[model samples]
Target chain A: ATCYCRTGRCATHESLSGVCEISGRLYRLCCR
Target chain B: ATCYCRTGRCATHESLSGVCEISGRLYRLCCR
Candidate 1:
């Protein structure tokens, strides 16, 4: 339900693509 | 000896806080 639950990283870090691969994938999938 | 993310070390050092954060928490008790 939450971005953290799905991506693991905080929204701030996730916004910057964070440092995790999953975060990137989530970003692309959600944002793009 | 580098800070891939710490102290800006590189060329053989790990970076700033990989975000592992213990990987597992025992959970806090008595949230006071």
Candidate 2:
């Protein structure tokens, strides 16, 4: 369950943190 | 404390609300 980060990046942002995007926006959540 | 929403709409989204954008993302905060 790790994908969809940015335009030039995908997953592996901050080790165990994930990004959630909706309506042209993104929300980052750290599940560790 | 009222502006910058999307392509056309802005602070009209809701009351006592402020959108914060950071790290290629955005966050909505409601104040009362």
Candidate 3:
């Protein structure tokens, strides 16, 4: 399993793309 | 400011809504 923050796109091949909520700001979410 | 993982909608009024990428799973992103 993997979870973290990312920008633009997920980093790994199995990575999924999403967003992280932070202070009304949307950051990229990368999970694998 | 706040940042963490949620399951549904953001928890706080000032919170922004988004999705967190975790192991190809989509979890709610809660930010305030």
Candidate 4:
């Protein structure tokens, strides 16, 4: 399975590995 | 990735998105 998420911010680049935690939320930028 | 959205650090905060566009793109800095 694959999944992706948007953080709505550019301060940080796209996360290719693991998950991206923004502010206080956990988001899956990419997955496989 | 059905999700949406950068480089070249600008003098001013580059816009990230439209009205929402950041200081080049279309992202409003955390202000509502």
Candidate 5:
């Protein structure tokens, strides 16, 4: 499973990988 | 170091552990 890094809700071994946006702010997300 | 599994760019030992959304599709990432 993948989740937004900003949420820090990765299952395990996942880390911030992508830079994304929500509203007007930018944050990192875990995605493959 | 962690990165996107999609990018296949994790440092080491990291695995796909999260699910994320981008555009209209879903993906996974590597983190720790």
Candidate 6:
């Protein structure tokens, strides 16, 4: 059995509304 | 200087025909 998990992601989004988790974005995760 | 994705994809196959995150394929992200 394989077990792998984490809290979550950074919740990064672009103002252009396309995808996520790239770079040079504004919104990110502060819950650490 | 390379940007990635928030939610990635999986699956590996050449016989299949479709679009990947990079191009046309199953999923050009992970393999697990």
Per-candidate TM equals 0.16, 0.23, 0.41, 0.25, 0.37, 0.14
- What's the interface RMS deviation of candidate 3? 5.1
Query: All models, DockQ values?
Result: 0.04, 0.06, 0.27, 0.06, 0.07, 0.04
Per-residue lDDT of model 6, residues B1-32, tens digit only: 11222233433432222122322222321212
Q: Could you give the CAPRI-style class of model 4?
A: incorrect
lDDT of 6 at B8: 37
- Residues A1-32, model 5: lDDT tens digits: 44455644544766655554444555667543
lDDT tens digits by residue: candidate 1, B1-32: 11111122333332332321112322111100
- The alpha-carbon deviation from the true structure for residue B7 of candidate 2, after best TM-score superposition, in angstroms, is 20
Candidate 2 has a TM-score of 0.23
Tell me the spans in candidate 6 whose CA falls farther than 4 Å from its real position: A1-32, B8-32
Share of reference contacts found in each model: 0.00, 0.00, 0.41, 0.10, 0.03, 0.00
Which of 4 and 5 is the better model by lDDT?
5
Which candidate number has the best lDDT?
Answer: 3
Cα lDDT tens digits, model 1, A1-32, are 11122343344434332232222242121111
Q: On lDDT, who's better, 1 or 4? A: 4
Q: Which segments of model 4 are wrong by more than 4 Å?
A: A1-16, B1-32
Clashing pairs in 3: A32-B23
Please give, as one word, the docking class of candidate 2: incorrect
Which stretches in model 1 have alpha-carbon errors above 4 Å? A1-9, A12-19, A22-32, B1-10, B15-32
Model 3 misplacement above 4 A: A1-32
* Descending-DockQ candidate ranking: 3, 5, 4, 2, 6, 1
